[PDB]
């Protein structure tokens, strides 16, 4: 793909080990990012520093776009590396120059913003219409319907930690524990082992 | 003072239609094949649960593109209902013709994309409020947002606003009664005065 190679040729590309922070919320935004390899988590936090994952992003994804269209904006979220990453970066000023040469690069950025806005709106619906209990339930259902969920004699099976569920949903690992139990005891699931079994 | 030549050039390739107050301009699930633009008026963007309760995702106003999320990949559906809040003049262009404008002058894309940006900051802050803010703080914050805003008013004790307990409830996600309950107690902690659809934020 010649457009992405052209584009990458004006970026500078760096490695970020697993668990490092690429973008801090409140920081001034004057650069765009792009995932050559790996995956990051876009996350937000409350007062007690509890986190919610707005989105996993993966190779081929732009990051830090939101400040590109009016100056003086702050980073809106935390981006942390989920695996080891290679991350291309370019300034808003250079990027606006690439957009003039070949506006298709803006077209591919805007395609992702659109998708991201559909996906974030779906997540507002949930937080508005489901309570925490339901959101944990739904989350497990979703993991169990992913291509990588493996098969089980009595339903579907997935390996996730109370911790990833806590981040997906906005509560602690211990609160996840209490609620898995409540879920076990209404027979929605069976969480014997670090593996969970989901049903029907 | 708030139109310009790029817009007018854009607007002149559109069919510009007038919609009454309360008409829905876009239905969720519809094949997205057309871009809209609010030449005058304001709209609510809405989603629903299986039980037909409504959540207001956003208000949009004159200047604002609508119906843009299908633009970049074909075969998509509208992700939300968009409903006229006042009487509206709204422009429409097919995606295919709009892709063509973007080649003529990419600046049209930069204006749309700016707006998608601001939309995702706002929807992301909303995701934060619903996950982390309590109901009463969410209402407190909504009142503050309406009050800080033109369409708001002026008053001896602050700004004053017009909004029923139901639209409130649709913005924060709670019933009308609960809104009424929380408004009262917000009255008691000296934060507002509330006479029906009309509120004085201090
Ligand atoms: N709802 C979301 N989904 C995916 N990515 C997001 C979302 N909200 C913010 N981001 C990304 O995280 C970045 C944080 O820095 P910026 O706001 O500059 O740019 C932001 C977007 O790239
Ligand atoms: N979170 C949001 N904030 C503002 N506008 C939105 C949001 N989600 C959807 N929309 C608008 O609602 C429109 C519904 O149809 P589209 O998905 O074609 O285009 C959508 C966007 O313009
Ligand atoms: N838990 C909830 N989540 C989201 N929206 C709600 C909830 N309860 C009520 N609403 C919506 O917000 C509206 C506020 O006024 P009503 O109670 O008339 O109708 C309400 C619903 O349409």
Author numbering:
A (entry chain B): 9 to 208
B (entry chain A): 6 to 207
Would you copy out the relevant sentences from the publication that reported this structure?
Altering local interactions associated with V140 was predicted by the ENM to have minimal effects on cooperativity despite significant local hydrophobic interactions; we therefore examined the effect of decreased and increased local hydrophobic interactions in V140A and V140L variants as a control experiment. The V140L mutant protein had no discernible effect on protein structure. As predicted by the ENM mutagenesis, measurement of cooperativity for cAMP in V140L by ITC showed no differences when compared to wild-type.
CAP is a 210-amino-acid transcription factor that binds cAMP generated by adenylyl cyclase in response to the phosphorylated form of Enzyme IIAGlc (phosphorylated in response to the phosphoenolpyruvate-carbohydrate phosphotransferase system). cAMP-bound CAP regulates the transcription of over 100 genes crucial for carbon utilization through its binding to a specific promoter region and recruitment of RNA polymerase. Previous studies of the ligand binding domain of CAP demonstrated negative cooperativity between cAMP binding sites in the absence of structural change within this domain. We produce coarse-grained models that describe global low-frequency protein backbone motions of CAP and show a strong correlation between negative cooperativity for cAMP and modulation of the delocalised normal modes on ligand binding without a requirement for a spatially distinct physical pathway or conformational change. We demonstrate experimentally that altered connectivity between backbone elements in CAP can give predictable alterations to cooperativity for cAMP binding through altered mode amplitudes.
